[PDB]
Amino acid sequence: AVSKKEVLYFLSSKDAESSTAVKSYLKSLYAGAQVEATETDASELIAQLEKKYLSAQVVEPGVHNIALPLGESGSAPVKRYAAELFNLGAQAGFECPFIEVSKKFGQETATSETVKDVLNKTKSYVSADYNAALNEVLSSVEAEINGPVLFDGKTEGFKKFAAKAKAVAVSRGLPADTILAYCAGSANEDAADKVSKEFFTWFESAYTADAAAEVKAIEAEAASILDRHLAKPVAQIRKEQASAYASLLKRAETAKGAKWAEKYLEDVKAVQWFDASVAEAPASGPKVAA
Amino acid sequence: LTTFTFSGLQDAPVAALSGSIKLNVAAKAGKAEVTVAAGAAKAATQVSAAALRKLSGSKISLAEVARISVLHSSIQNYLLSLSNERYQLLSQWPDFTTMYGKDFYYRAHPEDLKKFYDAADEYYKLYETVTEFDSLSALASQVVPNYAARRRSTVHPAIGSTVADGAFTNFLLSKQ
Amino acid sequence: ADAKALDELRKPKFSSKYLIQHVSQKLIPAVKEWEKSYQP
């Protein structure tokens, strides 16, 4: 069942087993059942931990429903794959990736008064080739002012670094004059529209260049998995995969009463149903009742 | 699809572009006499301009019935498409069974025939393991858990370095 | 027997979703009582 907070995440979700328990919960309220009170407590450390583990129950079936565009020509299968991950994050309660990772920077560096510290607390979220390219530009400005560059901004010593780090950003390939003017905006909406259309030209070229690098790594992982597997004899393969299947069924059958292992083995039965419904009529596929 | 759709019987397709099915409509003002003809069947109905608008009221919502996952089927389709690119170069192997005769056995050096019968024993090993297509479903499940844990990110499922670099310049090159 | 459904045939099978749920049903009620009984 649902605990009244999982069902609020699964309203906007569209995966099947979450839409099955919402339609089972919506059928109960039509049959005279009372909706429980939403809990007006659970302070901001507990509340953002419930968001972490409830978004993960919307993301995890949604990732397994998105087909990877492996070995495709063009950008539109890669843009389909990125658009499916955007709508999955929007259903799981995330905002845009630009808004959600800039929130991650302002959360990590709430107390950092020196710009060397923001390069050392947001090291996990920025590229190590770009963290290094801003640490060299930091030391070139650290040598001139002979002082720690402070994280204030209206200091003129800051824009000794900020006008030099902007030259790195155009050297890396991203237009920082366009990105900054999008999050600040302008007065008229006509000149804010042409800086919006130049920002989303970068943004669509940013996640498609990031989804394709995620696809080109799965293509390269499956190619090195296969070429390691094509070098074995078949009798080695058949007993290595029957051992890993048996080690993973006894991992799921020793744990009983858990919801994860009962639903694991129910899916082992549902794969065997799929193989049995194809053997009845292989020209039509599995039998779907309609 | 959205809730309300605004297409149908206005700038509609009037004729088919294929030969395997023939289409002719009668674009009147009120209704339309359409004739659909595909091979040995012929059907001609009459649909009004307000009957195509009730068509997109209830949505079809196609969904894929996969054996394990739609994700897992896309990795297995790539492993099947990579296993063809190796099968196609076992397709160009030279025929060694045309040199199994005893007039090739006895002209040859005894160690260059052991190497030939081992080069033929290797092809039957490479060919029997490239056609073990029932092992690709358990190979595609070795890619899935490391991929799915990357999409289980605390920032976003679709976050990458190029977005997070460009959002760091908006963080750094603004004030504070 | 055969011809199951569509709305439960659309389920991605070996996703986690319940090992994630097993943690959040044993982390959230175990951390609710951590900060209500918390003294430095």
């Binding site: 979220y125 069924l249 082992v268 | 070795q142 605390t154 | 986690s16």
Partner: peptide
């Protein structure tokens, strides 16, 4: 065909670690 279930989050944002090319096409052509 079934995989181990993991319940872990990715706290970092990194490049997805492209693996290097295997020599199976050049071995089978040798």
């Amino acid at each position: 065909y079934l995989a181990p279930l993991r319940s872990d989050f990715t706290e970092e944002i990194t490049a997805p670690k492209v693996a290097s090319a295997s020599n199976l096409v050049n071995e089978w052509n040798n």
